[PDB]
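Record format v2
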Amino acid sequence: CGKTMLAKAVAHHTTAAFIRVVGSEFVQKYLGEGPRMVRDVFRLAKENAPAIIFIDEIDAIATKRFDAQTGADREVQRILLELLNQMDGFDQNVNVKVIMATNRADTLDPALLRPGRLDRKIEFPLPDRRQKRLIFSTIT
Amino acid sequence: AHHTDCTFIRVSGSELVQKFIGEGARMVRELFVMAREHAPSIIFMDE
Amino acid sequence: DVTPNCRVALRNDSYTLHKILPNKVDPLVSLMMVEKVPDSTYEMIGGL
Amino acid sequence: SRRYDSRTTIFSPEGRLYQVEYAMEAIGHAGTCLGILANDGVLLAAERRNIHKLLDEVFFSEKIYKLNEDMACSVAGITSDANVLTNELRLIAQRYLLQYQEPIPCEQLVTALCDIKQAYTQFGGKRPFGVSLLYIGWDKHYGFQLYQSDPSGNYGGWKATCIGNNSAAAVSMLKQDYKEGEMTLKSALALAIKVLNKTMDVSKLSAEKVEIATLTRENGKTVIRVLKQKEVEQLIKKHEEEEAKAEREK
Amino acid sequence: ASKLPLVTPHTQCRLKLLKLERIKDYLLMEEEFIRNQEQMKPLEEKQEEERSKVDDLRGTPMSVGTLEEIIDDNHAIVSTSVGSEHYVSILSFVDKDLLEPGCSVLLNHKVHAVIGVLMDDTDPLVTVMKVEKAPQETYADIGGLDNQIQEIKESVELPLTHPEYYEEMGIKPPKGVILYGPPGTGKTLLAKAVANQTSATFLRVVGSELIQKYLGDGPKLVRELFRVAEEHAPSIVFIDEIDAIGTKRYDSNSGGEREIQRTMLELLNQLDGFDSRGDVKVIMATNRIETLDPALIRPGRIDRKIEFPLPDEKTKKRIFQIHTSRMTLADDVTLDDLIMAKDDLSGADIKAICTEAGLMALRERRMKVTNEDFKKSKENVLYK
Ligand SMILES: Nc1ncnc2c1ncn2[C@@H]1O[C@H](COP(=O)(O)OP(=O)(O)OP(=O)(O)O)[C@@H](O)[C@H]1O
Ligand SMILES: Nc1ncnc2c1ncn2[C@@H]1O[C@H](COP(=O)(O)OP(=O)(O)O)[C@@H](O)[C@H]1O
Ligand SMILES: [Mg+2]
Ligand SMILES: [Mg+2]
């Protein structure tokens, strides 16, 4: 439904700094590379510009259930804690905008969806006839 | 709770809350350790 | 002065106690920090 | 084949049975009816459920059914189940009238119906009826009478009974306000409007939302008047005047 | 310290005189066999010198290790905190005993040799499931029942307080006690007075919180539960609402009803295992007595079956007298009108009407409770 495509177009016509991360790469084999990998991105968004973070496949990190018996799950737990802190490390003065695109909203923590971090929710429903014919005009 | 100065502690049954309550917390009652440590407290619950 | 659940500074050669590290968190301050409830008051009550 | 049988006839291990008690659970919802008398005449008050703005408002009654030329009933429960019951005992009164050429005693009519309701609760492997209804009527033997049917198949003599959603809450005030034989059929009307004022959770007492029928003995008629919607609201505001001065005087 | 257990006598007996003077024999003779030590060979102090010789053997970096096996000739395989285990030796100040597989120990920093053992800070679950203090008042709070109070004192209290009556009879107490009836009839309220009465260690668990989300964590919680129950002493285990394991299905449990079933197999073991059980009494309560497994209700696993009927009206007035004892009752009220308000009112209904009537007095800042507080109190409590 143009989830990647709209970020391509905004990232093309933008004038600010665009930072484009792939949300299944924070699971490093080594400890700490994940959390440091979380914090330095937002540090570069801070120092760089009034910039824009983009995150895709959030279901790779933000799930609902957890298990403190594997370590592979405890690491992802520590991934979510870092970003959950760093979204609260803001003061409305920097213009750093976080765009996050997923496929399923079901496998998500609503603690991620609290206000102060997440307030704007955009579904991409299917066009039926009206916006449908416009896609035929553009592609044909 | 804000006006009578109590610890407004809601529970939701999540698992990121879990690591500060215990390692497994086989009951729910292990929250009462923190609750009697903040003895004037109020527990809140959703649907 | 040594409190349970408190950080410390430690030397490394003989593991001798050096200095008490300030503080860290309560296990509930972090909890409500994660939850982030919308703090309210009587001055935003609409007709109840 | 016997794997599919649900055994709607057997008892519980605690002695009772669950089917007709589930029916008596279902009778608490979906209806509010009451009857009251102390003198010449008897009143049935019925609270209408369907209050949608597109109804033809016909058939002379909603939950009221004239049984004989001198008796009638207010019904509560599953209406479709009730439809077979109404014309079912109606020709039982007619076969009494054909048998003896005489109007039927109201009590022994109710026993004959409650036998038929009792049979499905007893054998046959049949889903019983979740229908409970009142009984009003007059005879030459005891005058005005009042009876109450239950989905189990037993009956009972009363004078004033509600089987509403707040039925016991109504009865709690029914035994708080009454007088034996002196509540004339205007005082029992004003009391009845106070009762449905209480158990009617929808306030302000919409006159179209209620049904009230009376049964009086005229000399050879037994007039079963079915009051129109032009004299309800004057009784409504009549209650409204005395409740305001009754409040402010206290 | 456990010197002489003969403390019988209980008057001015000469045995008491000569026995305490013979403790004076072992102590006067051998206090003159305490003088000579540092008089002949001082050579150290032995109060701290040999003690600091141990403390100069063991280093200040005391690593904490974990046992998993024992070989008797003072060396064993111990677990490091990392996981890379060693094959170190065991010292002589290790008092070779308090050593079980899984025990926390003290190792060297250099060669990781077994220096000491560690006292265990236990687990919070014991403090969670362990009742600390007496809950409330005695059996006189109950009122009206008076028959099964003799039954619960019969099966629980009397075996504890009087271990003579069963021995003159040549008999053992009945094992399992179960309580059943309508809800709100005082089933937990009796166990409150039991927890007042007993001096044994008391445990309480709800039958709802047995169930889990992981596989086998239920039966494991059962096994460690009866482990905790046995590892103390005389104990009473209370189970509330055990029908709830069979009635309600929850989607947190990954296994279906054939995981609840296996939990019931483990508990079904833990009532009547072949093992030496010990002094653990079991008191249970429910209201749906007909739903659960009769294999658990058999004599041998539960011996005493106790039903609670509804309160009759002469017991009702007693319960009114109980819950209206210390309150400023205005003389406006008549309790007999409050008796027949509900034909099958529970004891909780009475207390609810009383407390809500007090709430109606405190809405109007008064001190006494009047009749209309009860009149609208039964409307508030009962009719909704
Ligand atoms: N016979 C009684 N006399 C006085 N008070 C009673 C009586 N029965 C119950 N109560 C009161 O009602 C309350 C509820 O009783 P209790 O908790 O024993 O009900 P229950 O049958 O154990 O319910 P459940 O077992 O389903 O939790 C108690 O706090 C108690 O004070
Ligand atoms: N009386 C009121 N005055 C002002 N805002 C209100 C009032 N009632 C509800 N709200 C709004 O609704 C929100 C709180 O909703 P609430 O009903 O407390 O949560 P929930 O939906 O979980 O019960 C607030 O953000 C507030 O703006
Ligand atoms: Mg895409
Ligand atoms: Mg109880």
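Residues 29-35 of chain C form the longest helix (7 residues).
The two ends of chain C are 49 Å apart (CA to CA).
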